[PDB]
Design an enzyme around this catalytic site. Structure first.
Site, short mmCIF file in Angstrom:
data_model
loop_
_atom_site.label_atom_id
_atom_site.label_comp_id
_atom_site.label_asym_id
_atom_site.label_seq_id
_atom_site.Cartn_x
_atom_site.Cartn_y
_atom_site.Cartn_z
N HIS A 261 6.79 3.05 6.80
CA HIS A 261 6.74 4.25 5.98
C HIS A 261 8.08 4.57 5.32
CE1 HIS A 261 6.60 8.63 5.16
NE2 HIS A 261 5.30 8.43 4.98
N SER B 16 4.52 0.15 1.49
CA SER B 16 3.80 -1.08 1.77
C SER B 16 4.21 -2.18 0.79
CB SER B 16 2.29 -0.84 1.72
OG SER B 16 1.87 -0.06 2.82
N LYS C 178 -12.04 1.84 2.43
CA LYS C 178 -11.83 0.40 2.61
C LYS C 178 -11.53 0.07 4.06
CE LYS C 178 -9.27 -3.43 0.49
NZ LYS C 178 -10.41 -4.09 -0.19
N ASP C 179 -10.74 0.91 4.72
CA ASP C 179 -10.43 0.72 6.13
C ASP C 179 -11.66 0.95 6.99
OD1 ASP C 179 -7.80 0.27 5.33
OD2 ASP C 179 -6.98 1.49 6.95
C1 HEM Z 1 -0.38 -4.10 17.99
C2 HEM Z 1 0.06 -4.75 16.90
C3 HEM Z 1 0.36 -4.13 15.51
C4 HEM Z 1 -0.05 -2.97 14.94
C5 HEM Z 1 -0.99 -1.87 15.48
C6 HEM Z 1 0.55 -2.89 13.63
C7 HEM Z 1 0.38 -1.87 12.72
C8 HEM Z 1 0.56 -2.02 11.37
C9 HEM Z 1 -0.10 -1.26 10.34
C10 HEM Z 1 -1.12 -0.12 10.55
C11 HEM Z 1 0.33 -1.70 9.16
C12 HEM Z 1 -0.12 -1.16 7.79
C13 HEM Z 1 -1.24 -2.06 7.28
C14 HEM Z 1 -0.66 -3.01 6.27
O1 HEM Z 1 0.45 -2.74 5.75
O2 HEM Z 1 -1.32 -4.04 5.98
C15 HEM Z 1 1.28 -2.77 9.40
C16 HEM Z 1 1.97 -3.51 8.46
C17 HEM Z 1 2.94 -4.45 8.75
N1 HEM Z 1 3.09 -5.09 9.96
FE1 HEM Z 1 2.25 -4.56 11.66
N2 HEM Z 1 1.33 -4.01 13.43
C18 HEM Z 1 1.24 -4.78 14.57
C19 HEM Z 1 1.88 -5.99 14.76
C20 HEM Z 1 2.73 -6.60 13.87
C21 HEM Z 1 3.28 -7.93 13.98
C22 HEM Z 1 2.98 -8.86 15.18
C23 HEM Z 1 4.05 -8.15 12.89
C24 HEM Z 1 4.91 -9.37 12.44
C25 HEM Z 1 5.22 -10.45 13.17
C26 HEM Z 1 3.99 -6.96 12.08
C27 HEM Z 1 4.63 -6.76 10.88
C28 HEM Z 1 4.16 -5.95 9.87
C29 HEM Z 1 4.70 -5.84 8.54
C30 HEM Z 1 5.91 -6.62 8.01
C31 HEM Z 1 3.98 -4.95 7.87
C32 HEM Z 1 4.20 -4.52 6.40
C33 HEM Z 1 3.11 -5.15 5.54
C34 HEM Z 1 3.20 -4.63 4.13
O3 HEM Z 1 4.20 -3.94 3.80
O4 HEM Z 1 2.26 -4.91 3.34
N3 HEM Z 1 3.17 -6.04 12.69
N4 HEM Z 1 1.39 -2.94 10.76
#
Ligand code: HEM
Ligand SMILES: CCCCCCCCCCCCCCCCCC(=O)OC[C@H](COP(=O)([O-])OCC(O)COP(=O)([O-])OC[C@@H](COC(=O)CCCCCCCCCCCCCCCCC)OC(=O)CCCCCCCCCCCCCCCCC)OC(=O)CCCCCCCCCCCCCCCCC
Ligand SMILES: CCCCCCCCCCCCCCCCCC(=O)OC[C@H](COP(=O)([O-])OCC[N+](C)(C)C)OC(=O)CCCCCCCCCCCCCCCCC
Ligand SMILES: CCCCCCCCCCCCCCCCCC(=O)OC[C@H](COP(=O)(O)OCCN)OC(=O)CCCCCCCCCCCCCCCCC
Ligand SMILES: CCCCCCCCCCCCCCCCCC(=O)OC[C@H](COP(=O)(O)OCCN)OC(=O)CCCCCCCCCCCCCCCCC
Ligand SMILES: CCCCCCCCCCCCCCCCCC(=O)OC[C@H](COP(=O)(O)OCCN)OC(=O)CCCCCCCCCCCCCCCCC
Ligand SMILES: CCCCCCCCCCCCCCCCCC(=O)OC[C@H](COP(=O)(O)OCCN)OC(=O)CCCCCCCCCCCCCCCCC
Ligand SMILES: CCCCCCCCCCCCCCCCCC(=O)OC[C@H](COP(=O)(O)OCCN)OC(=O)CCCCCCCCCCCCCCCCC
Ligand code: HEC
Ligand code: HEM
Ligand code: HEM
Ligand code: HEM
Lengths: 66, 98, 55, 60, 240, 77, 53, 380, 32, 54, 109
Positions: free
Chosen positions: H201, H205, H227-228
């Site tokens: 945030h 994104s 969509k979600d």
């Molecule tokens: C319990 C595990 C996780 C949860 C609940 C979580 C939660 C979220 C959510 C809700 C988003 C927003 C949805 C989206 O941007 O597509 C997000 C984006 C993101 N997540 Fe996760 N995440 C998790 C694990 C991870 C892992 C394992 C990685 C990387 C190795 C990661 C890296 C990222 C990144 C870089 C974004 C930004 C994506 C963007 O800006 O489009 N997250 N995460």
């Protein structure tokens, strides 16, 4: 009492690939039995014959049991 | 490699949505500084092309083949500003060296 | 400054000693207990099996 | 002549409270109707095998 | 031999995606287990309260529970005593400890047949192939006493003699108790004992399939409806 | 941060219509099928060769494993 | 690692910062041995060895 | 009269983070996976809460309690199979999340990516402890194997693993402490996921084009809300059809037997992602080397943002690195299959070839691919 | 000039009851 | 009760609830502090403390 | 260069909440009980985590597990009594917390 398993199994040895595996089975059988002392045991084509026979059984058995 | 570079340009895919190379290069701090140094008309054209790119990618569509940008007319507008900003950054870095 | 920082230093020495004792207390508590120490040091072995065998 | 969805909008869907009321009433009726339909499909696809099918042979 | 025989895929009545078990076969395989298989194998998780409403009725399962004796205690004087079993009692184990099982079965431990289908690869196909695949060993291997050839058991040597044969028990419904029929019935019963939630699970699966086949087009319709204003948006650039 | 100061956009006109005035599935097949084959053709030559060589390695490993468990015909005697 | 960490200014910066960095590593080592009661180091200090740890 | 949605503090936080959140309009279905991971985390919190309400952690009664959940508890079979297949679905969504980040260059968000790596650590540890919780044969033996891997550490590992075991092997102390740790760890996962969302945030994104999306933004409501919701329904479809038709397709049969310290299975085959970890362990033939290989194979995601040498963020306009990335997904699948397979020829040689290929692609081949791409596009 | 801005055609997206511009709404909008 | 009286089901479910509910307490304490930070803190005099704040 | 304490996001949240929070200068020792309640909460979290780490929740083994914690486990008796007396001190702090709230007019929030 007749047995549907025995009848289906007899049809399976009547099938072509099973009887080819069978002829390989007795071929390796007298190959092993001709030798006197060896560590040669051949279960592989027996596994192949049982595999093909039981595959054809599983195709064509359960219509008899109810 | 004119034909090979044209083939790689077409296979990259950003010409399909009407972008440019300088449109699609990623924004580091030097890149944002040079974008701030871009003039008004070039900045507006850049932002409209990016907005159309977002719209097309959202719709999962591309521009028509006649409306695709071509390798012969791909202007490199942001490049001299980017080189000047890179030169300024390198000069600051060597003054920090000294 | 030496008087004030000596006071502060003595406070943090006492706090560090207490905190080390607390953390060592907890990590020794989650370590092996008296039951598993007593059930492992002495193993009951007999000779009521035939030769060329395994138990 | 107003159409069927036109009458549904004019009678129920315009007011949000009536929208929620017809949602709940449809929830009741759809719950029971889908239960009957799914159960009927289940014992028709598994007729003669379930305990409710072979039950009468041992109940009496 | 490290090579193993993969069991064939028999066409069970419950093999289908929405097809449940044949409860008459579950019942028949239950008395197969009771009159044949219960003397060696334990059943620690199946009870008469699970038997009711599936293959036997309540009164039949109750009387079938009181036909066997169950140890209970403590007594008024503080001992054990044998009482007739009831619907709440579990199935009686044949041996008190696994050491007694190995003593009565010359070093081999008969496993608990309450999760054997979910525990062995192949499942009821493996059980049917194991029970019907007994044969003389091939020329080349000799098995010592207490060991029997079975190509479906890994290692090919099993501690069981063939437990079932033609007319090994008498069915109550008059079905001819051939070896294949008995093996199929006991395999279906073992599948039920491993997974008693089979019929309810498949009914709930049919309900889920119908409801989500109704909901996914509708939810996609709302998604495309709310997303329509973006997907039909047109852009224009009008510089001076 | 919030809407109002995200970007500087000039001379850009957007036209949109109401979801109740337009359709949820406007030519879902007659334009959906050319679009999906367009996307498949554009991105098919970057995924399919790695996946098919994974399939080849999988089946070759299974075949070589089964020949490894197969009997050696060198040791007849 | 990076091109911005080159030259004489950062070199003498590291020269100025290396004794206090070594002292921070030293107090980290003393904290480690004091917390873990490391016998291999605590049997060489002249008095603390009487704790038998 | 004032707007409560921006006036009330909890409501203004919800408004600024989930309601009027400016989001790129063009994000694909690959961006639903964060919400899917959060929904699956909540599903596992509730489901395992019920499982712990009906479950006791003691060696002579853990398997009996699990069987009692399956048989005597109403819908307890549904609850337990939901828990297991939802852990499988959680790791599917986690891997697709990581793959989305790798393909679209979301690792440039350094703090968000590092918190994601921490989340991956916590989720893998939680799922391992959950897998050993039912006290099956494979559960106990996999616990012994992983703890011996921890014991491969020199001069600390033996005492450290006798400490973790609560004794000298996996026993009642190990089972009870693993129950406590497994129950408690998803709350640390939820708090660190709140930190994850906060770090996301702070910067907004990422769009699939990798460009500046501030020219074309839409609110999170109602577009990405519906969509979600659709993504949640599709994930529920896959999860629930798995539970209700193939509850043992992703499971293990040897886990349905009581744990025996004497008897051992002929094969040690944990779950899919642990099969990947087991194969990258089994690649090189030394204990400490294999432990470091597994540790670097997980930390290589944290090492990823320093390896970005390209002038373009996403792989949408980079076709050579697309081929390298799909070859990387290919040998991810290959290493998972080798972890599934036993230890013979040619599974060995395929194992170390896949391991060297994976590590060489992430370390060497990807920045060289970016440099070649830039020099073809006159950017180098 | 601002009068040159004419909204483009949407007939590829309109519903069946709003295709023609010579028929007024409120007899079909409520049905939609 | 999970049954007909206080039994094994009651004890186990009380164990799960007692383990888990302090984390809901912690989250609600975060909400507590958030509301307090929004509304400021009170003084023993009950006056406006903005003249003298540290 | 930037001020990291007020520019880093988690750090500026921490700074605005607990470091540079404008607090009244004249609040007495009754204002410490909120921090005491939070610290007792954390103490209960850790201490009960160790208790459930060594605790079995079954009627046949609950009391025996408590005896095992108090006797066999290394200083698990100290853990159990810290847990119990920390719960008691938690309610002491809660009662003084609500006493401050009632007396000093803090219920206006
Ligand atoms: C319990 C595990 C996780 C949860 C609940 C979580 C939660 C979220 C959510 C809700 C988003 C927003 C949805 C989206 O941007 O597509 C997000 C984006 C993101 N997540 Fe996760 N995440 C998790 C694990 C991870 C892992 C394992 C990685 C990387 C190795 C990661 C890296 C990222 C990144 C870089 C974004 C930004 C994506 C963007 O800006 O489009 N997250 N995460
Ligand atoms: C083939 C015939 C249909 C056809 O031509 O469709 C073309 C159409 C694409 O043409 P288009 O209209 O130009 O593209 C815009 C999208 O339709 C615009 O829709 P969308 O694709 O953006 O929808 C959002 C996305 C949202 O999807 C998700 O969020 C999925 C989340 C991941 C899956 C669940 C996690 C577990 C994964 C385990 C592996 O949903 C889908 O991708 C498919 C939704 C299917 C709903 C049920 C239909 C019955 O494709 C689809 O509609 C895909 C589904 C049908 C095939
Ligand atoms: C973090 C790991 C801490 C390990 C630890 O405390 O070990 C106890 C020991 C206590 O010291 P010690 O000298 O009594 O024992 C060392 C020898 N072992 C551990 C094999 C029994 O501390 C260390 O070994 C310090 C390790 C620092 C790195
Ligand atoms: C600051 C608060 C504590 C200050 C007073 C206690 C200081 C201290 O360390 O006391 C020692 C005592 C343990 O002493 P003992 O076990 O005899 O140590 C020999 C081990 N070689 O330590 C204890 O008895 C432990 C006291 C713990 C108090 C704080 C608990 C915090 C829990 C989180
Ligand atoms: C972190 C990992 C700690 C660890 O692995 O500890 C295990 C070790 C077990 O030691 P112990 O409980 O004494 O059992 C006898 C066999 N060593 O435990 C130990 O050796 C005790 C380690 C104590 C560490 C205390 C740290 C205090 C820090 C205070 C900062 C102020
Ligand atoms: C499955 C294959 C789906 C597919 O066709 O992907 C191609 C798609 C191309 O998308 P793109 O080129 O960005 O642009 C859209 C086209 N104009 O590209 C994408 O959709 C990109 C998908 C990225 C995420 C894929 C994750 C797959 C699983 C990876 C697991 C391991 C990840 C690494 C772990 C360490
Ligand atoms: C050179 C090909 C030219 C093809 C021209 C086709 C006609 C073009 C004009 C008409 C348009 C048709 C449609 C165009 C679709 C998009 C463009 C396209 O497909 O381009 C070709 C594509 C990308 O080209 P590019 O990346 O520039 O190639 C450089 C050479 N590497 O490159 C490819 O598709 C080639 C990909 C080959 C990948 C082989 C991978 C083999 C190894 C996989 C190992 C996987 C892991 C296995 C396990 C390892 C460990 C044991
Ligand atoms: C307690 C023993 C007496 C403590 C004492 O000395 O209290 C006097 C103190 C005076 O405070 P004040 O009036 O602000 O004086 C400022 C003038 N310089 O007065 C105070 O400190 C008043 C606040 C005391 C708060 C703690 C005592 C009450 C605790 C129980 C409250 C229960 C509330 C209901 C809970 C169930 C519902
Ligand atoms: C006493 C003679 C038994 C009878 C009656 C039944 N079983 Fe058995 N079983 C018995 C032993 C001693 C063993 C272990 C033998 C060994 O070599 O390990 C078994 C084992 C099984 C197994 C497990 C096979 C596996 O791969 O793990 C199965 C599936 C099995 N037995 C089936 C089975 C059935 C269905 C029976 C009722 C008809 C039955 N057995 C009877 C001892 C005895
Ligand atoms: C607060 C959240 C959670 C709680 C309370 C919880 C609780 C439990 C309990 C009590 C069990 C044993 C019951 C049984 O196996 O039948 C279990 C099993 C398991 N848990 Fe969890 N868990 C939680 C979260 C998770 C998460 C987030 C994952 C994975 C990412 C996970 C993975 C598993 C797995 C794989 C099993 C084994 C299931 C099986 O063997 O069939 N758990 N969990
Ligand atoms: C149960 C755990 C609780 C925790 C962890 C907690 C935490 C806190 C903290 C940290 C403070 C700040 C300290 C201060 O400002 O003096 C505070 C203040 C406050 N608490 Fe609590 N609290 C809890 C319960 C309660 C209860 C039971 C009440 C009242 C019924 C309450 C009402 C208040 C009020 C009104 C304040 C403001 C005090 C002021 O403005 O001076 N809280 N709380
Ligand atoms: C996650 C947080 C907590 C956990 C894991 C936990 C865990 C436990 C466990 C396992 C026991 C039984 C062990 C024994 O009594 O010997 C217990 C007992 C108890 N708990 Fe907790 N607890 C937590 C928080 C709390 C809190 C916040 C309170 C009160 C404000 C509390 C009050 C008590 C009390 C009074 C007992 C009785 C101790 C006794 O009678 O000996 N607990 N707790």
């Amino acid at each position: 009492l007749v047995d549907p398993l025995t009848t289906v199994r007899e049809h399976c040895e009547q099938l072509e690939k099973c009887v080819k595996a069978r002829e390989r089975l007795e071929l390796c059988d007298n190959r092993v039995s001709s030798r006197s002392q060896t560590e040669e045991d051949c279960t592989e084509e027996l596994f192949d014959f049982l595999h093909a026979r039981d595959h054809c059984v599983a195709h064509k058995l359960f219509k008899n049991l109810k | 490699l004119d034909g090979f570079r044209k083939w790689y340009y077409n296979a990259a895919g950003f010409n399909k949505l009407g972008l440019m190379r300088d449109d699609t290069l990623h924004e580091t701090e030097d890149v944002k500084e040079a974008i701030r140094r871009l003039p008004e008309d070039l900045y507006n054209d850049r932002m409209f092309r990016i907005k159309r790119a977002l719209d097309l990618t959202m719709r999962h569509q591309i521009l028509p083949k006649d409306q695709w940008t071509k390798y012969e007319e791909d202007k490199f507008y942001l490049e001299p500003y980017l080189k000047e900003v890179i030169r300024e950054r390198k000069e600051r870095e060597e003054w920090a060296k000294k | 400054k030496g008087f004030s920082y000596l006071v502060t230093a003595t406070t943090t020495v006492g706090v560090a000693y207490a905190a080390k004792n607390v953390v060592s207390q907890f990590v020794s508590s989650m370590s092996a207990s008296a039951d598993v120490l007593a059930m492992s040091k002495i193993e009951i072995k007999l000779s009521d099996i035939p030769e060329g065998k395994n138990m | 002549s107003p159409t069927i969805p036109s009458r549904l909008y004019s009678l129920l869907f315009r007011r949000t409270s009536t929208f929620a009321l017809t949602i709940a009433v449809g929830a009741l009726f759809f719950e029971r109707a889908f239960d009957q339909g799914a159960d009927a499909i289940y014992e028709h696809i598994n007729e003669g095998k379930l305990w409710k099918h072979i039950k009468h042979k041992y109940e009496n | 031999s490290d090579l193993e025989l993969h069991p064939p895929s028999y066409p069970w009545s419950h093999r289908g995606l929405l097809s449940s078990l044949d409860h008459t076969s579950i019942r028949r395989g239950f008395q197969v287990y009771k009159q044949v298989c219960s003397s060696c194998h334990s059943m620690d998780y199946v009870a008469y309260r699970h038997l009711v409403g599936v293959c036997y009725t309540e009164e039949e399962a109750k009387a079938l529970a009181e036909e066997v004796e169950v140890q209970d205690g403590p007594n008024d004087d503080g001992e054990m005593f044998m009482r007739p079993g009831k619907l709440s009692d579990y199935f009686p184990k044949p041996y008190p400890n696994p050491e007694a099982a190995r003593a009565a079965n010359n070093g081999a431990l008969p496993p608990d047949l309450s999760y054997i289908v979910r525990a062995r690869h192949g499942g009821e196909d493996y059980v049917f192939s194991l029970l019907t695949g007994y044969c003389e060993p091939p020329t080349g291997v000799s098995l010592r006493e207490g060991l029997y050839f079975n190509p479906y058991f890994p290692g090919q040597a099993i501690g069981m003699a063939p437990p079932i044969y033609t007319e090994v028990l008498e069915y109550d419904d008059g079905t001819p108790a051939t070896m294949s029929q008995v093996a199929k019935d006991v395999a279906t019963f073992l599948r039920w004992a491993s997974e008693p939630e089979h019929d309810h699970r498949k009914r709930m699966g049919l309900k889920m399939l119908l409801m989500m086949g109704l909901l996914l087009p509708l939810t996609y319709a709302m998604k495309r409806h709310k997303w329509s204003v973006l997907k039909s948006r047109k852009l224009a650039y009008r510089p001076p | 941060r919030e809407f109002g100061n995200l970007a500087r956009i000039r001379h850009v006109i957007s036209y949109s219509l109401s979801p109740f005035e337009q359709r949820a599935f406007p030519s879902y097949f007659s334009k959906g099928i050319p679009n999906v084959l367009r996307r498949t053709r554009e991105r098919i030559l970057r995924v399919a060769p790695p996946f098919v060589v994974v399939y080849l390695i999988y089946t070759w490993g299974n075949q070589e494993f089964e020949q490894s468990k197969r009997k050696n015909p060198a040791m007849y005697e | 690692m990076l091109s911005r960490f080159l030259g004489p200014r950062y070199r003498e910066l590291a020269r100025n910062w290396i004794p206090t960095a070594g002292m921070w590593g030293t107090v980290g080592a003393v904290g480690l041995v004091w917390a873990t009661d490391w016998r291999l180091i605590l049997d060489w200090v002249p008095y603390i060895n009487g704790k038998f740890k | 009269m004032t707007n409560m949605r921006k006036t009330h503090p909890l409501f203004k936080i919800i408004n600024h983070s989930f309601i009027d959140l400016p989001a790129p309009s063009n994000i694909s279905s690959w961006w639903n996976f964060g919400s899917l991971l959060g929904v699956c985390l909540m599903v596992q919190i509730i489901t395992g809460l019920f499982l712990a309400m009906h479950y006791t952690s003691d060696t002579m009664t853990a398997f009996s309690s699990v069987t009692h959940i399956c048989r005597d508890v109403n819908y307890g079979w549904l609850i337990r199979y939901m828990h297991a297949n939802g852990a499988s679905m959680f790791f599917i969504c986690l891997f697709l999340h990581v793959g989305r980040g790798l393909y679209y260059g979301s690792y440039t968000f350094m703090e968000t990516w590092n918190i994601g790596v921490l989340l991956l650590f916590a989720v893998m540890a939680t799922a391992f402890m959950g897998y050993v919780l039912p006290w099956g044969q494979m559960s106990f033996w996999g616990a012994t194997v992983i703890t011996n891997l921890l014991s491969a550490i020199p001069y600390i590992g033996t005492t450290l693993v006798e400490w973790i075991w609560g004794g000298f092997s996996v026993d009642k102390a190990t089972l009870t402490r693993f129950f406590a740790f497994h129950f408690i760890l998803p709350f640390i996962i939820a708090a660190l996921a709140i930190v994850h969302l906060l770090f996301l945030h702070e910067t907004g994104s990422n769009n699939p084009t990798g460009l500046n999306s501030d020219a074309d933004k839409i609110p999170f409501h109602p577009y990405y809300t519906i969509k979600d919701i659709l993504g949640i329904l599709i994930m529920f479809l896959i999860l629930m059809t798995l539970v209700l038709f193939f509850p043992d397709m992703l499971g293990d049969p040897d886990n349905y037997m009581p744990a025996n310290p004497l008897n051992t299975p002929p094969h040690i085959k944990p779950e899919w992602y642990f099969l990947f970890a087991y194969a990258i362990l089994r690649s090189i033939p030394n204990k400490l080397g294999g432990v470091l290989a597994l540790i670097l194979s997980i930390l290589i995601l944290a090492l990823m943002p320093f390896l970005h040498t390209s002038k373009q963020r996403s792989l949408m306009f980079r076709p050579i690195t697309q081929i390298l990335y799909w070859i990387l997904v290919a040998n991810l699948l290959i290493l998972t299959w080798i972890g599934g397979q036993p230890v013979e020829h040619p599974f060995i040689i395929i194992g170390q070839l896949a391991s060297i290929s994976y590590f060489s692609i992430i370390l060497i081949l990807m920045p060289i691919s970016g440099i070649i791409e830039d020099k073809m596009l006159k950017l180098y | 000039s601002h009068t040159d801005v004419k909204v483009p055609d949407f007939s590829d997206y309109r519903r069946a009851e709003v295709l023609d511009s010579t028929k007024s709404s409120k007899e079909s909008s409520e049905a939609r």
